[PDB]
């Protein structure tokens, strides 16, 4: 349609980049950007040009309920700082991607709030791909080698969380401004 040419455009885009081991590509992009599909979608076709990829989604990383609902402090930050540890992740996943053969990771059910851990491999993958929110913050920006940022257009909740926290990060982040490529 149209779409599926911007995709396939990205895809060349990704192609063309040089490659020195492992390629760190990142997907951010706020909630509800399409990400995620974006993600899956992209991979599938790099796969189908002779690339192993291996996904991380980072949904699947958060903590429980518990710590980062009624924390006491306000949403936004709730949000930003408190649902994902930051610096675990740091340490046991993105200074991991260029070299480790696997990963044992705690994968979080939003359904049951709980936590199992999973492994996924990465041995010979030629290109890993992480999508999620918030993806250019400081600690883990040094460990993408390419970032595309997808540029998308009970409520006072809403803005609560999701829009302070969003403007938080376009402000102290600049993502738009960092990324690779926009994706609008
Ligand atoms: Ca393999």
Redesign the pocket.
Same mark, same amino acid.
């Given at each position: 349609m149209e779409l599926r040419d911007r995709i396939d455009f990205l895809c060349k885009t990704i192609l063309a980049i040089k490659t020195a081991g492992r390629l760190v590509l990142g997907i951010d992009g706020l909630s509800r950007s399409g990400k995620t599909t974006l993600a899956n979608q992209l991979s599938q076709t790099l796969r189908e040009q002779g690339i /192993?990829v291996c996904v991380f989604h980072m949904d699947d990383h958060i903590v429980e309920r518990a710590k980062r609902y009624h924390t006491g402090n306000e949403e936004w930050f709730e949000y930003y700082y408190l649902q994902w540890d930051v610096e675990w992740l740091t340490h046991q996943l993105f200074r991991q991607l260029k070299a480790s053969h696997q990963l044992t990771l705690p994968f979080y059910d939003h359904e049951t709030d709980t936590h199992s851990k999973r492994t996924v491999?990465l /041995?010979?993958?030629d290109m890993i791909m992480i999508e999620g929110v918030f993806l250019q913050r400081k600690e883990w920006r040094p460990f993408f080698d390419f970032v595309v940022y997808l540029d998308c257009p009970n409520i006072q909740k809403f803005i609560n969380r999701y829009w302070k926290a969003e403007d938080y990060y376009l402000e102290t982040e600049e993502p738009i401004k960092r990324a690779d490529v926009v994706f609008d």
């Open positions: /192993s491999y /041995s010979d993958s």
